[PDB]
Design a protein around this nucleic acid. Sequence first.
RNA 1: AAAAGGUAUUGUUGCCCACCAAUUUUUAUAAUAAAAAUAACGUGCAGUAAUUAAUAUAUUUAUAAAAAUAUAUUUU
RNA 2: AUAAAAAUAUAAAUAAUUUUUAUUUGUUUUUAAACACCAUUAGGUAUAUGCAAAUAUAAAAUUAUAGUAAUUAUAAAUUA
Lengths: 124, 53, 110, 360, 121, 221, 142, 42, 53, 69, 150, 88
Amino acid sequence: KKRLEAKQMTEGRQALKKKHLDLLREFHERQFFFWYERASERLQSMNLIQYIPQSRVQEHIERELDKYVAGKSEAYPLNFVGQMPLVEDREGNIVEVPEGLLTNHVSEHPESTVKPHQPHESTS
Amino acid sequence: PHDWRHFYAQEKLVRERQQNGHAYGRRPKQFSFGARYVKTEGYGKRPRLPYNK
Amino acid sequence: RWAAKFYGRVTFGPRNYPYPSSRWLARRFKMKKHRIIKRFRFRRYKLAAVANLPFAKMIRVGLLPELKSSKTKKGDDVEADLSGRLVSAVRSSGGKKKGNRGRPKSKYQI
Amino acid sequence: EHPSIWLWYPWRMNPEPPTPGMPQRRALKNLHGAVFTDLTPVQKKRQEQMLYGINIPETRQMKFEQEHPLLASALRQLDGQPKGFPFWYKKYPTRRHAYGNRFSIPDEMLEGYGEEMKKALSKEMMSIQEKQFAQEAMYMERYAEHDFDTTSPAVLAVKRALKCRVLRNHLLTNPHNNIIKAVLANTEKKLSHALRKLRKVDFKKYWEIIRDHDVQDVLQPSNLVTYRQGAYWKYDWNAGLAISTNLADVLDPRGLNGCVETGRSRSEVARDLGLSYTRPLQENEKKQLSHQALYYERLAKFKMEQPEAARALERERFVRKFSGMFAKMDIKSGAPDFPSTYRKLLGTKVVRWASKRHGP
Amino acid sequence: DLTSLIFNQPRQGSDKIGYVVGTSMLKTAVVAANHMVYYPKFNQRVSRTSRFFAHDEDLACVEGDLVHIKQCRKISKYKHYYVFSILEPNIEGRERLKLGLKAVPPPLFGYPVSRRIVKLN
Amino acid sequence: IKTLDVREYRPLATPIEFRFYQRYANHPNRQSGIQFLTHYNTHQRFRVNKDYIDYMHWGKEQGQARLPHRHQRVAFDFDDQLHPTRTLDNEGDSYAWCAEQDPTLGPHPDLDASFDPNRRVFSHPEHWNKMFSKRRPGEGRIDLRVLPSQSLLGPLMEQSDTQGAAYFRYDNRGHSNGRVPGLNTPFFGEFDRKMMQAMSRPLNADRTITGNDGRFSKTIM
Amino acid sequence: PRYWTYNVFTPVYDFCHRIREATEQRKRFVIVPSTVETRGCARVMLGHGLVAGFRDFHNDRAFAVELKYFQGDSTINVIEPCAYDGKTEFEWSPKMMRRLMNTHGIHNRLVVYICRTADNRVIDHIQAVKENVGGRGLIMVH
Amino acid sequence: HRSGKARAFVFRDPTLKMMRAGSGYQQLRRMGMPIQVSKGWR
Amino acid sequence: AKAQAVRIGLYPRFGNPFWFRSQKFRPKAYQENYDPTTYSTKHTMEHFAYNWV
Amino acid sequence: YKMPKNMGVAPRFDVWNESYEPWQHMKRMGRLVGTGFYIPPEWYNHFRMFPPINHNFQQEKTLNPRNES
Amino acid sequence: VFYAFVLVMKPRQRRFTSQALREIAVAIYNNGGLIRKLSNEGVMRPYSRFRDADNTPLTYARYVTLQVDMGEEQMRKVEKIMKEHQDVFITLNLNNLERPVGIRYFPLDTFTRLEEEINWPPQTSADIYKQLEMNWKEFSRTRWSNFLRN
Amino acid sequence: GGYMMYHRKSMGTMKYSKWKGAHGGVSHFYGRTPMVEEVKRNEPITLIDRRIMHYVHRSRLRHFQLFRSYQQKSNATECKLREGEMLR
RNA sequence: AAAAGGUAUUGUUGCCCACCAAUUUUUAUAAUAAAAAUAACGUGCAGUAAUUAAUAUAUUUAUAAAAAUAUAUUUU
RNA sequence: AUAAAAAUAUAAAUAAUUUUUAUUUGUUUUUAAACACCAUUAGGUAUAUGCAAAUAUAAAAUUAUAGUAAUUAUAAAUUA
């Protein structure tokens, strides 16, 4: 008799373990749903990351090493550390220097043609 | 710092537990000034924990 | 290690003596250990054990007539091939070699 | 040129190195203590099959088809196009099954996005932890019963088998990381403790495992001291696998048992029903038995054409049955082990035997 | 012990269950089964190991088959037993033989020694 | 050693610890003592490989840095309130499910949105083991595995144009006990901030009655 | 435990020393391990008044024992396991258990001893010797 | 005395001391456990 | 962050280049306002005096 | 070896109270006066009828400070 | 991102800096890699005079920032081309970008992002707040409408 | 031989002592200069330094710079004393 | 004016310590073996926070108690 | 008898089952690169590839290689 009662209760417990296996599957699918929503989202925003293939890097290198080309009808932007770098001209000539650095640079390179790099005034 | 014998036992016991429960109180051997940058190829330049040796 | 770290129950105080061993007993047993270490270092104690011996039954190299320090005593009987190995190695430990892992080189080694 | 000798000086802490100071790199022994200077070719192929990036096999595709044909038909019409509903979720029943790319990014999600994004999240940029875990999930996928069980014997054995391989490849590259020695050692103890239920629940997977992960050294018993009295065997007992057999479906359970009334053995009821329970016998067990099968042909070819030699050895044995030690049968005479039945008489009187005991 | 829990016996030791370990003697098995060593003072037990001799006419058992072993009239100097059944045949092993390999790989190391055996290469 | 006392030594203050060693511990890393009333897999609190106790900082809230934190205790005093029940995530309805109750009820003191008894409190030896350095103010293996980050890094980047999981209805399984009368379904009746009905003994074979006797009183529920 | 050298504890040991430490700390509720004879001991202690109550929340692992106090001191004056070990089961002869309730000629049901009989019941020595069966020794308490 | 025998912080219960002695040789005897191998007594 | 800025040479290998600019964020406390939770007791005694003054 | 100046006569900081708890004097005077060879103090004649409250255990034993004993 | 690489460089000629980056990026793409943000900065006056093989302490350096997606062991490959190049002074190498410290679990949220937003730069203020709010609103307006093109 | 500048014989002074590098404007201490303070017009440097020294004294920074620079203590004793100070 | 230790037990003119002589008694007899007891003479003054703080581990050193050194640790 | 000098990385590896040789606990290659230390003016050494269990306590009184005497260790009292 105890045989039958334990046989029973354990068939039920096995069934409930299966039922949990199934509710668990369902919960994992819901997971993947809410993970689609979240992840498709961050993957559009990754479509915007303008990647530079090998065919276009030889242009973007010039375009970025040309960020402060000593003359520009705009004001120039900052750095990753955000100073105004000494706005060079071409092939390696520091030809426009801000005022936090002209005093020190000309004192140590007495014979460089230095220039006080005037940012693009807002007035005009 | 020796009424906190049991506060140094704790952070000795932990570093042991990381050292596989063996090198309780063992510390990392003093290497050098230039240890990580002159020693040659094949011998651990940055002093490992104790229980590596 | 084959060495005995404590030559004596240095730690003996009443249980819960919140330390490994009182400085008294530590000094007593460091005197026993200074006697043991000077006995060894001054009779120029040398032991040895080589592979494929029963490594527990040590070799007494300082008890060899080629490295004997005593004169009226007889050190030990050792096979000739093993003797020529050992005592050559004892001579070999008489200097440390530049171009290898160095070693602590003592006078009492020779 | 001779056993290496260390010159211990007692006044010091511990010896000097040997003068034949043979090794330089400490040699990395197994879980129970045997060398490998590298892993087997199986495992080096399993390193190139881990660092090239495993692709999800097409078995999942085809099971998804012949399993959910409606989600496949939806995909069948939707192939290539930027999808706004996940018609592959039932194909990837869990985060981990999406090991074919990065971040559990299922293949059929990246269509519309940039080819550069598809390159970013492909098998080419998976971290090394990513790639190890990828192989892990793929294998725990094809050895598990249902895709949520990670505690099956086969599941666990394969997972820890890959695990111990990456560990050994770590070590045989970097030697003095001995916390990792005690990583590999305990992990292998558990992989053995799982494979030694696998080869008791279904050995087929067990040998596919054996011959794909080439690890038999972690089952190979170490110390005869144990496996003389059968303790390396007691483990599949202790776990509860003494009866996980199904002889009713491999080895015909009829003759594997004696009787109670008779007392006769397994092979004797197999005699009285005509069945052949016997292992494959090695060539030695074969030749000893063929030789024991021809002794009566030898007797018939001996006594019949050289009954002189038959008679000659008659004389030899007939004198010997009277010479020698004993001639009647007492318990003192035929206690079936004299030397150990009589201990008080072996060093002094009976110098025939040099020891008091030779058997169990 | 296990034996008296499973089998009624006429006289002690008659019936013994074990991991058959060692059969290399042709037609002969070594069955390794335990008894009971009770410590009255402590109020506790420890059952103990013993490599037996056990005849098996016809060479079936392989190292590991959990077998039942019964006693008889003696069979040799040392075997007073015979393989009275199998309780589980090591099916892995039987197939290992069929394929040809050793039904059980042999222990990696020997008995404990006192000499530093220097195995190189 | 010289095997006999050279000293007429007679020190007279015998520490209770040296005598009754079965009760106090003077080894370091044994001061944690015998704590049977933890949860750990041991009674010897100094053998629990789990939660090495920071000794200088803890104890502001639990007595001493030995005893377990008041969010992990397995044995509760009388006038000391036992654990609060972790409500559902949103915690808007933990006061709406006393809408049956007196209209003005406040938040229940035995309710909590974020009561986690596996919350590891910060230890200085566990997470900031300064052992292997000069202890110079900058060194230390600071392990950021325990504390919930304070950075704007998270709440900035893990912001989504979609909604939250509480809206997405992500979560299966609801509450672990299924249908609890304070968090899932409405609480009818009175609150029991003691355990006067929980520690009640069945006086009936069908358990239709339960009992709770003091010494001179008897409560029949 | 881990080795040979350790005694093998048991739920009956740990429940007794949970309760001992809580009555030594003047707690109220203890969360005490839950095995059949742990709550066995608890139901008879509660019948014997050593405990203000207990509760089985059917928590597969734990259940809670609410302790009773008197004049500042715990009612469970002492509580010991029959065995500081698990590997040593102490079957009590019915005569052993009858020579506890016999203090030098005065019948003394004071110290209550919990023993688990052969019938898989957990009873005090008083009902164990009122039916002349002896059981595994579980705890002594008073 | 880091090297002394252990002493009970308190006397053990004599009732427990009795109850642990229902399974020792001097009760195995009068149960009947031994098999008398010799003449035993005269 | 400091020992990476110092690695790439974008913080002085020694020093504090942003000290006075940084002073605006660092909380000037022992000048006029009395943060009662200070551990300087010279400050508290200035204030006890000044108000006793 | 420098120990705390007044340490020698320090009180046992956990069991220094327990001598004084009112329940101890209730338990200890109850028997002194039950003997019948003692004339109970006038406070016993009262705090016998009004024994102290039960669960006011000291923090030194209930190692729990947040406990409103 | 997989990796950030801040390459401080000697302000050589625009034939030489360009050619350094031509060989560097070509090394990445010969090493199965990607590049996201090859930012540049004009020269600046660091806190350490860096010395090449000429032992000269050069106090002015042109800057390169290069974020990349590579293989994590091709990382080791390309970096020892980089450091050994005669022109870089030092490359800050960040592995921590996938998993910064303030996080922890969703792994894309940082991998998508760039360095300029894992590391808030010094220039920024309390204005990029409303600026990123408008950027998100007016990207997420059409982030789905645009993907659903093909 | 080659000493760190916090060692006693940092800038040796004798016939054979040599100090490396230039010492004007950009000195060897370009990135190793802790505390510069621009003099205001006419302000007393007997005030600039009589403040610098008090700050670097209360911050027990001169404590440490003197301490660790003279005798390279045992890490044990350095820990012993530093822990002793945190504790006191 | 305010905080400090003892191997001594009226207590630094206090104790101990080692090598250094005979003795004894057992013995696993490495310059001269090892250990147990003891109460000469002599080098000193090595420990009692003790005259460059002590204690454990180790390299080296040596008329002896020990020291330089390298580690930890406070029985500083 | 030159002395100026050596900072960066997180997740992350599941627990329970017989590794009792296996592994393992601070001596490391090289100044033609130095500090340090030792010896001394005339050098060596200048710091985790072999080798090497070992504090973190499973306990039965000190010593003593497990035969020697009858014990020894210890903490708060007292000390300008």
